[PDB]
Amino acid sequence: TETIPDVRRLRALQAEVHEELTENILKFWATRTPDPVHGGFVGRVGPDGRPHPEAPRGAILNARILWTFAAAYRQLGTPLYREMAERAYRYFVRHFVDAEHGGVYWMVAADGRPLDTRKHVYAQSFAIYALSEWHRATGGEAALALARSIYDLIETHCADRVHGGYVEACDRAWRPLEDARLSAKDAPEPRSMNTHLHVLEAYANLYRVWPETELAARLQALIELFLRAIYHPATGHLILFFDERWRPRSRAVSFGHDIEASWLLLEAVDVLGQATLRPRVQQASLHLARATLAEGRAPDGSLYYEIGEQGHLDTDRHWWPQAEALVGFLNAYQESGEVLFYEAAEDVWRYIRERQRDTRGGEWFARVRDDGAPYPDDKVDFWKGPYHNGRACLEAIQRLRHLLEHV
Numbered sequence: 247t248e249t250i251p252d253v254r255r256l257r258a259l260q261a262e263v264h265e266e267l268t269e270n271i272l273k274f275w276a277t278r279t280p281d282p283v284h285g286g287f288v289g290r291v292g293p294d295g296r297p298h299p300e301a302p303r304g305a306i307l308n309a310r311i312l313w314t315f316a317a318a319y320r321q322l323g324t325p326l327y328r329e330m331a332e333r334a335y336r337y338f339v340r341h342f343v344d345a346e347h348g349g350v351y352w353m354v355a356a357d358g359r360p361l362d363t364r365k366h367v368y369a370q371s372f373a374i375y376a377l378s379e380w381h382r383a384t385g386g387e388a389a390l391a392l393a394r395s396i397y398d399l400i401e402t403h404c405a406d407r408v409h410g411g412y413v414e415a416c417d418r419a420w421r422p423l424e425d426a427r428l429s430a431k432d433a434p435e436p437r438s439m440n441t442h443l444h445v446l447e448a449y450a451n452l453y454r455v456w457p458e459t460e461l462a463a464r465l466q467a468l469i470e471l472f473l474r475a476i477y478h479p480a481t482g483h484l485i486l487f488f489d490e491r492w493r494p495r496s497r498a499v500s501f502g503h504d505i506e507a508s509w510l511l512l513e514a515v516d517v518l519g520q521a522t523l524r525p526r527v528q529q530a531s532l533h534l535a536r537a538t539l540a541e542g543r544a545p546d547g548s549l550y551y552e553i554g555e556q557g558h559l560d561t562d563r564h565w566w567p568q569a570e571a572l573v574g575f576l577n578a579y580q581e582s583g584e585v586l587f588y589e590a591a592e593d594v595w596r597y598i599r600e601r602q603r604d605t606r607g608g609e610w611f612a613r614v615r616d617d618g619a620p621y622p623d624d625k626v627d628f629w630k631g632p633y634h635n636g637r638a639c640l641e642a643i644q645r646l647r648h649l650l651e652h653v
């Protein structure tokens with residue numbers, strides 16, 4: 247009694263996603279961004295497509311490059327992707343990893359000198375995520391050892407054992423900082439959904455390759471924290487910021503984070519095999535997906551950016567909520583069998599192809615205005631890597647593969 251798109255549509259979508267990933271996204275990243283002056287990858291590519299090999303380089307961006315090429319190599323086998331992942335890994339271990347205090351710096355100069363040595367848990371998480379993926383792709387001993395060491399440092403220096411969750415930022419020597427903001431956009435609050443979501447993402451990937459008993463407990467605790475404190479059943483949205491006891495300190499809504507968490511939370515419970523927790527997670531996941539469907543979309547099926555603290559709807563289409571909606575809506579279809587979620591995934595894909603991707607300049611525009619005008623944002627910067635859209639394509643390809651095997 248399944249309602250399933252026919253084989254032609256499934257395969258056509260899967261082929262388009264594969265083409266987008268390999269002939270647009272990963273081609274852009276492998277050709278435009280490697281830096282032969284300092285090694286590794288440039289920190290910025292302007293709106294005109296010009297790379298900036300002297301720009302400062304973010305740990306999150308470089309972890310995202312490593313993760314994406316590692317994952318693409320694992321799933322597709324293309325040798326260039328292993329080469330690019332190795333390139334990212336080598337620069338990462340050389341320069342971003344703090345050999346003295348452990349963990350990864352926030353920002354290095356292009357030549358590798360530390361510039362911002364804070365140890366932000368969000369960056370530590372992306373390091374774990376990328377290093378565990380590189381281990382998954384290669385069996386790399388050192389990659390896994392490094393991921394485990396960063397996990398240990400997060401638990402040792404940042405875990406709030408009274409209230410759950412984590413202090414989100416420390417200085418180089420792991421002393422907590424008051425200002426845990428990722429950027430000026432973020433509320434000056436001690437706890438954020440965003441950082442905790444990516445701890446969960448990292449821990450789930452680490453557990454997949456290293457099923458340590460204590461890590462399972464920490465990951466389950468994070469799932470339970472989302473269910474009890476962050477997910478808001480009255481509205482179907484994640485609460486974004488909190489004090490240390492998880493009292494809400496924001497009313498903003500992030501549609502992209504809702505739909506990302508919708509599928510990441512289920513990936514996390516399934517990595518654990520926690521069948522007892524899964525019904526509650528699936529319920530919250532489907533709720534987040536329905537709330538996104540009903541409240542976060544433009545009539546073309548693309549996702550708006552946010553409802554701000556004053557209630558203003560930011561109608562800009564940022565690139566990464568569209569990517570996360572592609573995966574999250576496909577995932578919601580897989581979980582519920584409700585083909586309306588597949589229709590929604592198809593609609594966001596069509597928007598990605600017709601508006602968000604930059605056919606002339608390559609990759610995807612960071613932002614498209616409500617009237618269709620692409621903003622002249624950088625194509626690559628501290629916050630724009632290949633991970634959201636690369637992962638989204640890889641996820642969709644594999645999910646469509648599974649759906650194709652239902653026949």
Ligand SMILES: [Cl-]
Binds near residue numbers: 310629630631632635
């Ligand atoms: Cl990204």
